[PDB]
Amino acid sequence: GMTPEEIAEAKRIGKEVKERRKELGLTQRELAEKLGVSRSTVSDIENGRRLPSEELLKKIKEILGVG
DNA sequence: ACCTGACGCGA
DNA sequence: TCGCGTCAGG
DNA sequence: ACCTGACGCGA
DNA sequence: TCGCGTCAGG
Length: 67
Fold this sequence. Notes:
Elements: H1 4-23, H2 28-35, H3 39-46, H4 54-63
The structure holds 4 DNA strands.
């Protein structure tokens, strides 16, 4: 499974993503359109259940500024 | 949150 | 190839 | 104030 | 997709 530190980063990114999405008044569906991914994938990261892959980490910082 | 098709990697 | 875990959209 | 169709998000 | 909570007009 994931390393204890991997879990931590999961929670970190997701919490940051959610907070930046509320400031941009975005829905998960809308943010997923921006991030070029599924709305379910948004909730997955947003709940620290899965670390973003390489393609999405690049987009997360591009769209939200979180890296 | 759970069901399922598909990719990543080997007590 | 065979087999579970995981990644992804629905 | 309550009934109901529809959107937001996952102990 | 499935399922409750909530948002909205009636």
